[PDB]
Amino acid sequence: ITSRWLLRMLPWVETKGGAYRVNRRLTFTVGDGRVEFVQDGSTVRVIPQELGELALLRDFDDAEVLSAIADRCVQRDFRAGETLVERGTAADELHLIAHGRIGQASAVTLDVLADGDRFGEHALLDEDARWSQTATAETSGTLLTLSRADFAAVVANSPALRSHLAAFTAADYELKPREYELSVAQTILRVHTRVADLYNGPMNQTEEQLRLTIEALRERQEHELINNREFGLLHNADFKQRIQTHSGPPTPDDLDELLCRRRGTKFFLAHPRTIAAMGREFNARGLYPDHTDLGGQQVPAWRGVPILPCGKIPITPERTSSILALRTGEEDQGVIGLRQTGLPDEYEPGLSVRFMNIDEKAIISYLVSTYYSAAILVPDAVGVLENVQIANWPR
Amino acid sequence: ITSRWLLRMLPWVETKGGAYRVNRRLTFTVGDGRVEFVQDGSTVRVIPQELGELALLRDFDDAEVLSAIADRCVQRDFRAGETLVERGTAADELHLIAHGRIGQASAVTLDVLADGDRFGEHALLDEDARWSQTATAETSGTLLTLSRADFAAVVANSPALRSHLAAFTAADYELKPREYELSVAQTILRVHTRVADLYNGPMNQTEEQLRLTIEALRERQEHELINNREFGLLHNADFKQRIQTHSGPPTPDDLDELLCRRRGTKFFLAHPRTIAAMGREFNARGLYPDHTDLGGQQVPAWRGVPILPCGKIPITPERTSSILALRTGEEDQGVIGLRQTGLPDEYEPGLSVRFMNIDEKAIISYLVSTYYSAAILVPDAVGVLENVQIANWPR
Amino acid sequence: ITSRWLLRMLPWVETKGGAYRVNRRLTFTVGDGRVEFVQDGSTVRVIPQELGELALLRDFDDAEVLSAIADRCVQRDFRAGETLVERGTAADELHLIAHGRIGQASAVTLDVLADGDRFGEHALLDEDARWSQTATAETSGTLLTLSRADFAAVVANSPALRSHLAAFTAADYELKPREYELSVAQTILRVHTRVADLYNGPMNQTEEQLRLTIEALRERQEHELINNREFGLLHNADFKQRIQTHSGPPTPDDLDELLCRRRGTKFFLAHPRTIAAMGREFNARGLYPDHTDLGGQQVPAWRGVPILPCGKIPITPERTSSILALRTGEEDQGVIGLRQTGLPDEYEPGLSVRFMNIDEKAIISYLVSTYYSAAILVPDAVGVLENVQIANWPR
């Protein structure tokens, strides 16, 4: 029953066969100290050529070997405050940071690794490797892991890798299309035959129940567009586009930075609690931002970019939320809503309700289905400001 | 396949939402020695104010206490010849007669209690109470029972009742609406797919089977309109409107009495055996009643009121049946047939046949449904003459 | 003679029969430590299932027993600074907090209970219970009370509760409609016959007196719409929608929070003194809010939501007032004004003036009547900011 801003703001394009294709160019350089990954929603995998940044694999440029090694790493997720490695424990895994920040405390907190950093190099070659630092995850993120035994197996498989290892001991264009498959929001509406036969004259309780079902399906559509893992703006956003607040509350400098990272931002999406926190920051700064009109409706905005409330953005137990800045369009590479219309039996242009059967207990079943998905044409179309403290008040 | 006179004689009114409301006024007086009850078909309950006829509760006029006591009695039914209480057995229950006649034989058959009579008064207060008479049920009927322990509990709950009991030891208008809910006659017609594909050219065995199903549903409708307990003229008729024959055979004096009790009687309903018995009585009296025409059809009548045969009126093993005298109409408060038309998929104006599914065994299922009920607007619209001996011949 | 903003801003819907029905869904969960209540204006009652949060009643799920216990609690209101319980006094009542904050000072001020909190648990079972803390009401509110003797009586009534107590010693959907009945603003206008016969040519002192009567009735309508207890936005607002100021003066952060709690707020209602205090806060913060136009009339606003003055909002002796944020509409679930037009004799579309009689003293009497009420379709349609200090000046 709440407002679904993402449903009414995302342009909808018609897919053919319930699938869409987005052509991705992933420019990366070898030797700059940062490993680049390929991200398909929440699943990430290291580019094989970038594996070479690792010294023990520098100048090795055999596609088979690199592809095998890249295929043999395992993705892991870490939460805030979680310890990944402990001092004293023998080192046996190479960890490549794909997202999040990880603080390493030595025997003296050395520093904080970030996206594209590596720790666990020496663990690959020798068995004497021992963790001398404790890695505490300051922020939630992902991490690729290459175990020593698996790498040893890959070495024992390819003679070229063996020879290169024995010898060492003494902008790239990569096109890879991304395929989006339409997801389904489905439900079964069970209407008793008596309710369909009698209560249908002045108002149809069958039609009202169908309306409630459609509203629930639309709410689920919005919740999935925001929070789904495969597709979904919160998770299917580039790791470079995800920013951290400078202080923790959503100060206007953070909004300026969020607008800096991409051209032609269309709007902001945030929880109403987050919008209240942003308003508190505006009042503290002493500035009164203007309000702009979309669709004949006035709405708060920052620098002319409307800020739209979305209750589907999660609030963590630590009372920290996130803000989304996103541009929408097809002619301008942005975020589109993939949806197929012209279904065989449409109650609504995107919907399909079809009679299933009548049970022995005289209960009619209807199948209400809708097909939807989200596509982000270019990486710099959705930016996420994370760890936004929304329970901060003046003191 | 038999004639359904009640289906074709009862006017049919369209209910909204599958429900109807009848406003009942129940005039009763306190202190006339007769307890009045509220009857909703076959379930009966004593009016709380009338409970006061009982001496141990006279002049007590607390609505809460009377309502609780009325709610705490239990309804029981007794058949003819059944013994309710026996001499010598300790008395612990108050019995209020709602219908039927009960002969009490003392240590000398005293008399016969009838509707509104009470026996078991003293059993309420003291534990010494003992049954000194044997109550044999001469006629089937209902009876409300108030146990000593339950009444003691109600006394222990309300201090006002305690004080009134301690002190004693030393036309009313009551509106209460009656709600009628439409009942359903439903069935599933299973037609094999071969029988629906081939045998459909010169005659449809599917359509003929559907016709047989509809006829069976109509027969069930008539049987329920006569014999159902919630609604149904035999049971949902006022206890005052139910009369007993003076002699046992249906003599014309009984028909005159049946016509006496209500104004504008429309017709009589009786079993064909009962009509034969009435004809035998007419021949014995030497009078030849006239026949009147309804719908261009000649029919036997008494005093111009047609007598219609109904085979759905039960015949008891003792060969005793009943006769119904009833007026029909909406403008004149009588008996109406509640029925909702305009169903989503009507084969007939009151019917609804809908395809359910086709089984793995290639059997098509159809759901044939009809919604019906009966309403009696005023109590004096259906009169019943009971215990009519129909196996009596001249000797 | 003052402006009646609520009368001219609330949409008016036509009730049938002088009554309206609002269907309420009350979602509650058992075991989260908070008791949910059902509120009908100013009268509140605990949901029977929620009673189970209490340990001594956990896992007991008998509807009869819970319903009886819920029915047997008594509602009490407490003012600010009022002491409810005192240390040393024996504990005999269970107090469930429905609204307001209550600070408990032990032998060391422990904490402050709020809506949904309970204190007095142990008092239910044993008679040794003694108050060891003093409860001072920091804010006015309501509180449900379950006495030990009443609970003991309920235990002695139901054997199942007895057995469960003996054994222990060793999202839910609840639909319950709310009915609104139209209230009446009525008055009698006494006009002397001489004043009606002579003073009627250039101006009618009868018509001018009638105009004054109508204005007084409209003022009473507004005062009741604001301050009435059964209906009325100040009292008939959800306990969750009532917020407390962070500091006490109406700072813009409080307005942001008030706008946070509900979607599509239409306008604010506050006393002119409260609006002056809000303006003082705006000047202190150094921000100059814009003004928006409603009905071709410019009005102060916050974030584009107009702030309308209402002199009918009470000012407490401690110089603290309240602010109302409310959205109006029927298509969007909000606040509507229930009113029936088409009266038998209308001087104005909502009014009815009818001649009563002429007294022996030659005084004509007229009855001027209007029927009105207010409905809040969903709980999150009226929010109240309470304890707003309006007598604060820069120092």
Ligand SMILES: [Ca+2]
């Ligand atoms: Ca690189």
Ligand SMILES: [Ca+2]
């Ligand atoms: Ca009586």
Ligand SMILES: [Ca+2]
């Ligand atoms: Ca709860």
